[model samples]
Target: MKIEEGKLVIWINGDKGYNGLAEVGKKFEKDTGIKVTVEHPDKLEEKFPQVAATGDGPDIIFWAHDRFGGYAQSGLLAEITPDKAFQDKLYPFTWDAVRYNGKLIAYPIAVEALSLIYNKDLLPNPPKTWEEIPALDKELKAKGKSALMFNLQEPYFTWPLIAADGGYAFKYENGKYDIKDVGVDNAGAKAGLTFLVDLIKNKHMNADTDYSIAEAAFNKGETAMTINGPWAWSNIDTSKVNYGVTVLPTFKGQPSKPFVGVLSAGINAASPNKELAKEFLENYLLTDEGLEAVNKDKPLGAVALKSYEEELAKDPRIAATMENAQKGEIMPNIPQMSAFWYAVRTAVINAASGRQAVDEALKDAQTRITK
Candidate 1:
């Protein structure tokens, strides 16, 4: 591909963690004589698609992988395939973020997922299995506390329990999401939903808890554990409670993986600088040098580069958080994925509040989502 001489525009969501890229852009211009400009619009997610539809969009868009599938399917994103050497340097699961119908539509830059964070002062040692929670709950109850707590009505926080035995909102295989196969009512999901309901019925956990309530209790040391993502660390760190972050313990001998969210960079399909944008993404922004530069000021929170694994593991908390994220399933990017959030939340509330049986609630969720 010939070098494009005009300025290359890149659209990024936020103003932070990306200013470093402006410095990298200078180097690209010096090397290839291709000027680079990074733009942050007021409402990028809404504006990017509208501009791209008119063939007037930025050459590159840096955003989350959750939108990659829909954009790629709509013919708005240019398909990409990073070199074998580059792909080999990243975690395998990172590819899941940028793939749509088996084609690579973007390059994944950052990752985040939920994990079990516990008050170390209270538990001393975290439970290694779900079965152990009940006895601990009983012991903690004597002290006027609970073993674990999370936003019970939010599917994002309770995903581990639902995905414990291979449950999924949509069936994914061969790099595509089959929206027709809503898997919430499957046997594995039933088992998980049952376990979630039992936690409330057995009084192992409080039925009336939301994000604020659960986080407040944990920060006050009134609760032993909570399920949360890395973004919650800042608040927890400032609290008096001594906390430890780790992967969720197994449920009924099955590993519980959370939904992983990935931040990515994609090229606009109608751009005149596709090749230049590709070079910028793969060679400039995603390299070990590039990644370090982007995160130098703010740290991207978690990176998926295997080359940086040893250095990243130096911080045990970040290492454990990344480990749990690597074990997670990428949040599906299909438009139908929106159907899952509300339906599952309703089911959890129904079962937790005794309005419907566990199995019945799950079945209701599947039907509503499918309809």
Candidate 2:
């Protein structure tokens, strides 16, 4: 395979250390004598395919794996097959994020998942089990705060409860999603939905609470606890609320597992320097030192490479979220997931709001999704 030696361009979202990676690019250029440039474009997710088809896209694109299915199916991303050694060093579960039709299309760099975050001042000793959660509500209420506040209608946040008992959006096996198998109405899912509705019926949380409401309450230190992803820290830190993050409390003798989202780097199929870009991704960009450099300005949630475990544990939020993430399920990246999202979100809202019973709402979701 002949490798091109020239400028190699990478397009990455600005939020995830796009500027910090300039240092990595400098090092790459020094080693390979190939100029490296990193650009952060607006609406990258919407524009990547449009420009790639014109045969003028960046050699590498760094972003979340949620768009993997669309990119791969459109023939915009190159298929990647890393050796066993590289695969063994990374968390195995992360592969699901970038896989499309059983083919690896990108390299997982970092992971993000929701976890239990509490105000240390409000509840010094947070609960370890779901049943224990209600016990704090009494004390928190006296202090003019709620025990936990989150957007109940959002499937992304409420999925942990739904998945607490093995509920799944789609039947995923052997790196393939069985779209025909809609498990939203299964026994496990029913139990999970019931738990959420009971919280409202029991008056532990208000039924009208949503993302903005929950975030504003937590930001003002009016709420004792809330579950959120790593990106939440920016606002929480600015609010100066004394907080601690940890794995979610156990529910019904099992830990509640949130959906994990993995950030990945994919090579453009139409790029002229595929071999060179792949070398940069595997040999330079994904190494422990490379990731550390890219995330130096900010920790990228949970590191996917096990070699970075010790470093990841140095941060309280990253370490705790990683623990929760390990127990969580990877969010499905298949195209059919588009249908699952709408169906599940509606079910959660209907069930939590008492518009329909948990079983009926979920059954309705299954029917709509099946169509």
> Which candidate gets the maximum TM-score versus the true structure?
2
Give per-residue lDDT, candidate 1, residue 196. Answer: 81
Locate the minimum summed-lDDT window of 10 residues in model 2: 1-10
TM for every model, in the order presented, reads 0.93, 0.95
Residue pair clashes in candidate 1: none
**lDDT digits (tens) for residues 1-371 of candidate 1:** 12233778888877446578787787788889988987778899889888777767788888889987778878899888678888988888888778897899988888888888998888979998887998999999999888998988789888787878878877778888787887788888888888888888898877888999888889888899999987788789545898988878888788787888888889888877877888887778777777777778556767877766557667767787787887677899988888889989999888889899888988988998888
TM-score quality measure for candidate 2:
0.95
Please, what are the lDDT tens digits per residue for candidate 2 over residues 100-156? 888999999998899998888887788887787677887778777889999886899
TM-score of 1: 0.93
Q: Could you tell me which residue pairs clash in candidate 2? A: none
